[PDB]
Each structure stands twice: as structure tokens, then as C-alpha cells.
Design a protein around this ligand. Structure first.
Ligand code: MG
Ligand code: MG
Ligand code: MG
Ligand code: MG
Ligand code: MG
Ligand code: MG
Ligand code: MG
Ligand code: MG
Ligand code: MG
Ligand code: MG
Ligand code: MG
Ligand code: MG
Ligand code: MG
Ligand code: MG
Ligand code: MG
Ligand code: MG
Ligand code: MG
Ligand code: MG
Ligand code: MG
Ligand code: MG
Ligand code: MG
Ligand code: MG
Ligand code: MG
Ligand code: MG
Ligand code: MG
Ligand code: MG
Ligand code: MG
Ligand code: MG
Ligand code: MG
Ligand code: MG
Ligand code: MG
Ligand code: MG
Ligand code: MG
Ligand code: MG
Ligand code: MG
Ligand code: MG
Ligand code: MG
Ligand code: MG
Ligand code: MG
Ligand code: MG
Ligand code: MG
Ligand code: MG
Ligand code: MG
Ligand code: MG
Ligand code: MG
Ligand code: MG
Ligand code: MG
Ligand code: MG
Ligand code: MG
Ligand code: MG
Lengths: 82, 119
RNA sequence: AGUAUGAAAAUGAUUAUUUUAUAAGCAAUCAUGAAUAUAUUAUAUUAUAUUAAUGAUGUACCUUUUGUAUAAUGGGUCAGCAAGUAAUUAAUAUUAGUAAAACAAUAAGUUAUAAAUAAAUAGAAUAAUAUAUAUAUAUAAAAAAAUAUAUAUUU
RNA sequence: UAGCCUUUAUAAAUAAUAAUUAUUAUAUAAUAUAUUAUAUAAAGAAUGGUACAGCAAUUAAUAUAUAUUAGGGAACUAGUUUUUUAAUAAUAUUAAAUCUCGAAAUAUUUAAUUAUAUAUAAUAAAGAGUCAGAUUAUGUGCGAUAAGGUAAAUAAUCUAAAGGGAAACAGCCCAGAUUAAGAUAUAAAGUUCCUAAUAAAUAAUAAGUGAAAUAAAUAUUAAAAU
RNA sequence: AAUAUUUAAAAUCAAAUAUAUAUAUAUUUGUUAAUAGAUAAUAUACGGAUCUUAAUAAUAAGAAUUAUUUAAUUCCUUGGAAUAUUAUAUUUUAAAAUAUAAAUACUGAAUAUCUAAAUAUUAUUAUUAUAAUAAUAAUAAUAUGGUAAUAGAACAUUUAAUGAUAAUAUAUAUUAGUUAUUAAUUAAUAUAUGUAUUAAUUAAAUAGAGAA
RNA sequence: GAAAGAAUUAAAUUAAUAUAAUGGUAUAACUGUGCGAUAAUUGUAACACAAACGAGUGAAACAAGUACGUAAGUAUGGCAUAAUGAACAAAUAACACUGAUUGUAAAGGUUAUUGAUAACGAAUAAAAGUUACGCUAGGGAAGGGUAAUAUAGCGAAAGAGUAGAUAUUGUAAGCUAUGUUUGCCACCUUCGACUCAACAUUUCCUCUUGGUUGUAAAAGCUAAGAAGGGUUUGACUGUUCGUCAAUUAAAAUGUUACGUGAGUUGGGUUAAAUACGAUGUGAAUCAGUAUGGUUCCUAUCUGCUGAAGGAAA
């Protein structure tokens, strides 16, 4: 099981301890998705930043490449070269 | 006070709705955190994900902060909270010992659910 | 203050195109009609260029400041000119040459090749890594603080 | 000079940052009234004395048809009672920058573990600039619980940060501009028109109260509950 | 009805959540309003217009204020189900029946994604010719606001060293094209010159001016 | 059952600690007592704390020696935190290190010790004032905020009012407004007269009205509406103000950069000259007095007063 955590809010008005926690967690920019294997340690860290973050549990995690592939929009065309 | 910080003493309807939504989101986050931990513990014992989700007896979190957050006396949910504590902080130097939450700096990020028992 | 040349700009007058006499502010940008001009592939229901219909956004520039649209500094405009350079040295770094030597070749010198110590006639494994050795304090000699020296080829 | 900034590198390198575990108690199960496992509860290893709370000791304040110690009056024949004056005791009730016997959270902070390594610490060799700061919020000192005041503490922004909101806006609420594009999610803030975007529900107001900068004691009129 | 308080969810009751559970325990929530008081000097000043509803009568308006809420309404556990609504189509007699849909409120930044482009680093490739390299191109990721400051890389100008070429050329200017463009290049036009101290690499600088 | 001992428990650190205050101290760090008088000793001190540097603090250990203790051991001054001062230049000793031709020496060094720089990181061995005759470089390293005061109002009403708190009056304390006074802050570097005034209303006069055992009348007093019109001339003083005189229906109070100096004035304030009183040794000075005494401006824009041209009628 994995927490899919997302940095919903910015870190602009945020104090330095909370910023440091966010950095440790692994979230860079706003809406930067990160999957974390569930445990007590990561849960407590997420609780510490509960108002900046959106968490949701998952069966499986996704690698960055997979996430990118999921994101990619449908090109509404099929090329045929001649 | 020649510089004009034109901030109204009370919130609009739309502001209040947004605040409520934010409060609800933090409760949801907490719920997710507890749920994931429970699922993990079920897996450790030796159940599948689906089985864990089904389980009648949900495991309560052992770490302290999480356990406190779960308690409504310490950290109440938005549905539990009073109208007043959603939209008014305690401010000892204000008249009424109360102040709009929107007047708190970084109120959109910072959480503040519980006020004192009689203030 | 040479001689030629000079569609360099500021600046003046005039003509052409275009906009402008019910509209208000860095005079621009973006949207967007219209009018005009040019176009030897405008085939057009065309393309570029010029032009304050109309709409939206838009608080000169620099300096100095916690902070300037500021009614703080400075500038009438344009043209030309106007500010981290050299010498003698020292320390770092990078590369290149040579290398336990380098530079210099007349010798002399500088740096390196040994660490110390105020200084002195002292100065690095007695059988190997420090638990050995060298120096300064101390001493009969060790120990003790400090730094340095040693595990086919010297750095 | 140190603090904060930059460049180039070094490893028998993770030492950095964040959180968890660590404790106490209960119930259940298994071994030998003890130990281990599981679950739950508890602001949960170590350090602390602010808030709060408190009146212990210290320093202060009040009351007793209460008691004692003396004094001033007063009635009968020096003894005696009452109306007392102070102190002390007793009982009850109170507060303080330099009182804390109770006592948080935040905090300081340790090991291992997990997560951050397209990431941190440390060290080495070198370059700086800066030492007039401002506002907002919270807790104070000074001031008059005055100042766009003054002095420092913590956080953020501005400083050096353009963009959206707050009519206009250095410091507030969101959010950090490599260059475009403009379909989708949106933040704060908004959705009668000016102006991009709205429909409902239940109550209350009738004063244009109010509608993004809340003006007090008090008075009048209602309304509920007892 | 009258007198007198209080304006309260601490207690109390009601409702909801969590532990054994038709009950107990613990927690959370629910208790007035209006007016007057009211007040200075360029000019009304919610930013402005303006906002308070009304039967007859609308395929139609009825806060744009205050307070508690929702995203049609009601149960069940974000989700489904039922209910009526609204719109539409069909069938039947402007109505009825059947069925399809809408229920994801929306606006909103230079936020994030998508869509492409650039540079830098990390990790994989491909092509072409310290090949463990270089150039170019892919993919995935991270980064790219900036005063004081630090670091890296370029361009214009002038001189010195080397140096083809040529009026069908070169230089300078104007106009319009081109190349992710302080620069250079193409064409046309103009004026000069029988011609670049030219391209390129080095060396250097009286080497770039809206700020004295 | 009794005596003695060992003691334990409770309380106490309120006494005492050389000395401030704080923390600590009865297991005593406090007190008494024996010995002693040594460790108020000598060389190396890691490692920490603190920390810009200079310094500061705790200190294991190694080595030499000493005192107490049966021993274990303890002592590198004081229960702790203050009790202090760099270099340079001199001075005194010890050291045996250098000895400018050699030898001595001198002189320098090492080790220990000495006195102060209190503006206390100490500029020199050694330095005060004055300028309105001044000069240069720079910095700003009435308006704005506040409303203690002031002015005005409100609530409550002690108390005056021949009687009755509320006709009229209204202690001290309470709640506000104003930005008219005197302050405070430091974002921000001229008083009066003349002339012309514009605005406010918290109204002085004029108009309307409520109350007034304290409205018989008439004069008043107090309050509500009301800013249309009006609201002074002289003597004194630079004065605004104030005192007075004579009037008036009344001689209201403000705001406007305490309106108005590119509109006038320049008496006050103000520099150069001079004198007086006081202060100073003095140059000179003054919340002093007096006589004298320096700025100018043709209007570009806005605005206002008038006057034309053009124009879409
Ligand atoms: Mg017109
Ligand atoms: Mg305008
Ligand atoms: Mg500004
Ligand atoms: Mg200017
Ligand atoms: Mg101007
Ligand atoms: Mg000028
Ligand atoms: Mg010796
Ligand atoms: Mg420095
Ligand atoms: Mg670790
Ligand atoms: Mg204290
Ligand atoms: Mg205590
Ligand atoms: Mg603290
Ligand atoms: Mg400073
Ligand atoms: Mg400065
Ligand atoms: Mg300030
Ligand atoms: Mg600055
Ligand atoms: Mg920043
Ligand atoms: Mg901005
Ligand atoms: Mg960026
Ligand atoms: Mg209104
Ligand atoms: Mg208002
Ligand atoms: Mg209750
Ligand atoms: Mg007004
Ligand atoms: Mg508005
Ligand atoms: Mg972006
Ligand atoms: Mg940049
Ligand atoms: Mg030059
Ligand atoms: Mg020029
Ligand atoms: Mg420029
Ligand atoms: Mg004590
Ligand atoms: Mg430290
Ligand atoms: Mg040191
Ligand atoms: Mg003593
Ligand atoms: Mg002693
Ligand atoms: Mg001296
Ligand atoms: Mg000699
Ligand atoms: Mg000094
Ligand atoms: Mg000093
Ligand atoms: Mg002196
Ligand atoms: Mg004089
Ligand atoms: Mg003022
Ligand atoms: Mg009386
Ligand atoms: Mg009074
Ligand atoms: Mg009036
Ligand atoms: Mg009468
Ligand atoms: Mg009239
Ligand atoms: Mg004046
Ligand atoms: Mg003028
Ligand atoms: Mg005299
Ligand atoms: Mg004369």
C-alpha cells in the first residue's frame, strides 16, 4: 500500500520547519505528485504538513515514466505517410 | 493609522464556504492517513488489499500525533465544529475575546479548530 | 582653424497619405474596423507597410533609499568626447614545458629537496605503523602535549 | 572579524534534513506472581518551569456577637461585665516582572530505523557583498493597554518578487515570470450591470441598518427562557 | 395575564459521533433583535449604478443586506438508489402516458497538467564522424524571478600577425524579407571605390554611454 | 516488664555560607575538633564548554615532589557565579641561547616578576574654548500620525436651588466625539496689518418652537429647528489677544499651508554695526532690552475674469 501525496498548496507563506518537512517528504513544486510506501514514519511526517498536502491511498505505486504516460493527452489523429 | 489595510472585520459567504471546504480537506487527509496505516498493518498480518479494506475491525494509529488528530475533543471535524470556531479565532486583546480567522496570517494554510471552553 | 565628401541626428518650412472639432491623463502595448500605398505567381475571398474609429491594459527614466508616479536627486534635444590602467612585488588557481628537481648556463642566485626551536655544537623504523623515530617542554631514560618522518620504488 | 552568499574539489563519506520507535497502563493469549506477543488507551525516552492554575512558603489584601494578650471607658461592693482599640492566633476568602508546592502545548534534544541521494552535512583551496532595514501577526519592555512611536523575541513577506485578489495599495490574502501556446484542473478572491462568472434552501432585518475600513457607556421598544 | 430575573447548552434537555451495544459510558453540537446615542469645514461618496416587491398577469421579477447551509430534494452506505423538477422527443386525447438527458454549479493567476521550443544537470538511447570522445537528435526526471555579490559563455568596434578573392565585386546608407535576431545575411535602390589588414585563428585595446 | 545502645521516621537549609543577588548546600558546601599549614606546589595538559579574533571556563590523564588519612583516598586555594587591563618602552632576578674580526664584554633572547592605559581592545610622553565675520563637503541618516492635555457632548446624580436632584445649576469618578490649544512621535528639512475673501455650524443677531412652584406683563434663563441675510469704529501696543471709549439688531466660533508676501506691507521675529544689564579669565554669549538695517520675477501649463475666431446646423 502507498500514499499518493500531492503538494496542493505553495510553500511561500510557510515557515522553515514545515518547508524542511516537505523537502524531506520529497515534494518539490506545487502539484508535484509523489508515491510513498506506507509506514508510521511517513504518516507522521504527512500529518505534520496536513494543510499543504493532499494524500490518498493506493494498491500500487507508479514510476515517474508511468505517471507521464498517464498524463499525456490523446492526439486525435493517425499519421499515414506518403 | 495612515496606511490603509482595508481588511473587513468579517468574512463573505464565499470565503466561509472555502474555509469550510479547507477544513473538510484536512479531515479527509487525516482519515486517509489512518486508513493507509490500517491497510498496511492488515497486509503485515497477511491479508490482501481488498480484504484489508473490507475488514470490520479497523486498526487505530499507534503514533501519538495521529491518535490525537483522530480524537474530536483535540481535533474536531468540520461537521463536528461549531459555527463560531470555523469563522472566529480566540484573541485575548480583542473586544469579545474573538477575532475573524481571516485576520490570522496564513489562515488558508494554518489550522486552528479548538478555542478555549468559555472564550 | 587642413582638403574633399556628406539622404548622421537634433531643428525649421512645405507637400502627400491617414486620423482628428461631445472628449480627459507616460501618449505605448495588445485587440480590431476602416482608408491609403506597394506588390513581373493578388490564382483571391491575397500579402506586407503606413495611419491616435472603437475596446482593453498601462503611476516616464535613472540615482538614493526601509520605501519614490512622487510635489526627493539629475537630465532642453541630438552629435562627438567622458571612468578598474600601468609599473615593481607577494599569494592562490588553471593550463603548458621540465621534473627530484625547476629557472639560469658566465658564475652567482631564488624556490624545492626535513620537520622543528627564541636560539644553540640537535635532526627522522636499534627487529616495522606507531605502540617506532625526529624536534620543542621536561629528563637518567621513558611517559605526557604538539606537529612531522617511515608500510620494484625516494617526494 | 564572525554570521548569511559564490566558485572549484575531497572521500575506507550519510555523518545532514523529516518522521517513527523508545514510555506508562489495561485486556486477551502463550511460557516460567514474572516474561514475550497482539490489541486498545494515555498529549507517551531524557531536559525544562512560561501560559494556565494556585495561595503552600515569601511578599501583600479582607472579614469575623470566635479565642488570647494588654489598653481605654462602665456598673455594683481592689474584684466584674460589656462596648470595644490594636496585635497574635483560628477559620473563610483573595494576588505577584523579580512567588511557583501543581502544570501544558510549542520547544531543546539522543540512538537506531524508514524516507529524502538528479539530495544533504563536513572538510580543503579561493572570491564577495552586507553591519541605516521596513511592515504584518503573536508574546512583552518603554509610552497613557497613545503613535505610520520606540526597544528588542519568533514567523512571513517586502528588501531583491513580476502575476491574481484586497476600489487605488513595497510589507495583508493567494502564488514565485526559461520561451510560447491556451484544451483541462485550479489558488486567494469573486459570479445584477459597470466587470470575467449563479442557482437554491431555511431563518432574521425594514433601519438603505447594511451592502470589503463593525463607534462606547447608557436609554427606549420588542423577542425568548425561567 | 401580573411581578422579577436571566439572555444561558456549565448544568439541563434534544440531536449527532465513538467504545461493550435496543442500554451504558465518553466526546461533539444547539440559547435574541431593532432604534437612538452618531458629530466640521472644496462635493453625495457601499469603488460607482443601484439593491429592499406586487394579487390581477405574464414561456419571465421578488436583496444585490445579515446568519446557518447546499450544489435539484429525500433515505442508504465520495458512491449508488428513490423522488419529483426542468428541457426534449414520441404516442394518445392545450393535457395525459412512455422514454432520453441534465444533475460532474461556474469565473479566476505569469499556479499545476496538456501542448510545443530553449538551456543545464542526471539516466537511458539513436544517427554522423579522453569513439570511455565530439557534434546533432530522441525519451524520463529535476532546475531555470532576482538588488548587493560570485561564476561561466558570447557578440559589436579598433589596431597587429597570417590571408584567397573582385565593378557579375566590395563598403556605407535606406526600405522590405530571412536566421530564436545587441548580430549577420538576401533583394532592390543610391553614392563611393579598380578596391577589403576581408573569412577564420590568435594577440591585444583610448573596446560599447539616457544618466557625473 | 524495665534499663542502655544502635538508631530509624517526621521536620528543617526559614539559621549558617568572608561579601551583592541568584542557584546549591544537613549525604551538608554549615558548624565543632585532631593533625597540619601542605596542593595559595613544579613540567606536559588531551577533550569539552563558551567563542569573530584577543581572551574566558571545566578538566581526564602522564611525570616530580608535599600534607592529612588505619585505609579507601583527598588536596594544583576559597559551595559557585564578580574582585579587572593588550602590546610597546623601562626595571629586577634566574637561564647559558646568541656574542657582528677573535676573546671578554656590551646588547638582544628565553623563563619568572613589577607598576596603567576607568572614554576600562588601551590613538600621543604631552592639547581647552569661541564665531551673529565665518567657509567646504554631505545629511536632513508647517504637512502626516497620536489625542495625555484642551474643547464639546453623553450616561449616572452627590449637592445647590426659600420647599423639590433633573426651571436653572451638576463635585470627584464613568462612556464618547473633535483635531480648534499645549504636548508626544519624527514619515516628511514666519507673527501681525492691508486686499479679496470661499466654506463649515458647535447660532452672536434676525425667523419658527418646547420648558421655565423658579413663563403674570416686560426683560430674561435654558433647550429643539434654522446657515436666507447680517455680524464695528476708535485710544494704547508690532502684536493676534487684551484693557478701555463710543456704538450696534448682533458686535458668534472656527476651517481654508493657524486662507491670502510670483497680490501689498515689513512694525514683531530675524545676520553683519553699536550700547546696556547679566554670564564668562577671555574671545564672546543671552526662552534679556534698545537704535539701525537686502531679495527679485515680462506668466509656459492648470485655474479664474472678460473678448474673439473656427465648428456639425
Ligand atoms: Mg466627434
Ligand atoms: Mg479616470
Ligand atoms: Mg509605490
Ligand atoms: Mg520629479
Ligand atoms: Mg508632476
Ligand atoms: Mg532640472
Ligand atoms: Mg632542557
Ligand atoms: Mg567579511
Ligand atoms: Mg541517521
Ligand atoms: Mg519570568
Ligand atoms: Mg516546581
Ligand atoms: Mg523556550
Ligand atoms: Mg544597524
Ligand atoms: Mg548603507
Ligand atoms: Mg517601525
Ligand atoms: Mg538596498
Ligand atoms: Mg525569497
Ligand atoms: Mg507586487
Ligand atoms: Mg521560476
Ligand atoms: Mg449605507
Ligand atoms: Mg464603511
Ligand atoms: Mg456540555
Ligand atoms: Mg461626508
Ligand atoms: Mg465593490
Ligand atoms: Mg508556470
Ligand atoms: Mg536569471
Ligand atoms: Mg572608449
Ligand atoms: Mg552618444
Ligand atoms: Mg541603456
Ligand atoms: Mg539561597
Ligand atoms: Mg557551540
Ligand atoms: Mg580560541
Ligand atoms: Mg567559604
Ligand atoms: Mg571551605
Ligand atoms: Mg605608548
Ligand atoms: Mg665581537
Ligand atoms: Mg575609546
Ligand atoms: Mg573601548
Ligand atoms: Mg585627548
Ligand atoms: Mg551681534
Ligand atoms: Mg496633524
Ligand atoms: Mg439637597
Ligand atoms: Mg466632572
Ligand atoms: Mg444646529
Ligand atoms: Mg414673557
Ligand atoms: Mg428662500
Ligand atoms: Mg498663515
Ligand atoms: Mg506660489
Ligand atoms: Mg556688561
Ligand atoms: Mg536710518
Amino acid at each position: 500500500v502507498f500514499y499518493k501525496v500531492t503538494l496542493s498548496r505553495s510553500l511561500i507563506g510557510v515557515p522553515h520547519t514545515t518547508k524542511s518537512i516537505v523537502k524531506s517528504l520529497g515534494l518539490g513544486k506545487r502539484g508535484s505528485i509523489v508515491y510513498k510506501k506506507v509506514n508510521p514514519a511517513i504518516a507522521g511526517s504527512l500529518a505534520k504538513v496536513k494543510e499543504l498536502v493532499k494524500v490518498e491511498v493506493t494498491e500500487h505505486e507508479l514510476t515517474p515514466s508511468q505517471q507521464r504516460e498517464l498524463r499525456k493527452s490523446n492526439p486525435g489523429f493517425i499519421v499515414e505517410k506518403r | 493609522g495612515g496606511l490603509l489595510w482595508k481588511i473587513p472585520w468579517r468574512m463573505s459567504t464565499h470565503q466561509k464556504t472555502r474555509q469550510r471546504e479547507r477544513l473538510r480537506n484536512v479531515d479527509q487527509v487525516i482519515k486517509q492517513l489512518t486508513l493507509g496505516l490500517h491497510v498496511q498493518r492488515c497486509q503485515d498480518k497477511g491479508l490482501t488489499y481488498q480484504e484489508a479494506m473490507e475488514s470490520k475491525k479497523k486498526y487505530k494509529p499507534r503514533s501519538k500525533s495521529l491518535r490525537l488528530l483522530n480524537k474530536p475533543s483535540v481535533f474536531p471535524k468540520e461537521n463536528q465544529m461549531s459555527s463560531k470556531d470555523k469563522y472566529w479565532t480566540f484573541d485575548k486583546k480583542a473586544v469579545g475575546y474573538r477575532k475573524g480567522i481571516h485576520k490570522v496570517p496564513k489562515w488558508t494554510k494554518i489550522s486552528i479548530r479548538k478555542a478555549p471552553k468559555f472564550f
